């Protein structure tokens, strides 16, 4: 109890289609729309790095 103090409770939304869409171009940038719907149709492969 000596060391404990009230901490600032914060919340942040992360948009994963933005975190992948904004990926630095030293990795291949991609929006999830065009790889989800082909790595299902092929059942195979990869995107990003």
């Amino acid at each position: 109890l000596k060391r404990d103090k009230r901490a600032l409770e914060v919340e942040r939304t992360v948009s994963l289609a933005e975190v992948y869409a904004g990926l630095p171009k030293d990795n291949g940038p991609f929006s999830l729309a065009q790889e989800i719907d082909k790595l299902v149709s092929q059942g195979s492969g990869s995107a990003g790095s």
């Binding site: 109890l1 000596k2 404990d4 103090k5």
Partner: protein, 49 residues
């Protein structure tokens, strides 16, 4: 012809014992600390302690 005097020893002294006391100073209060708990809870805590 002379009969000597029959000198006779006195009672033993009462032995006596000495009983002395010891004294030690008054205590000292810690520095008070202010904490995140409303009084009824910190009181149930301290009372338990």
């Amino acid at each position: 012809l002379y009969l000597p005097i029959y000198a006779t020893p006195a009672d033993p002294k009462a032995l006596l014992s000495a009983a002395v006391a010891t004294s030690q100073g008054g205590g000292w209060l810690p520095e008070s600390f202010m904490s995140l708990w409303r009084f009824p809870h910190m009181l149930e805590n301290a009372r338990g302690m």
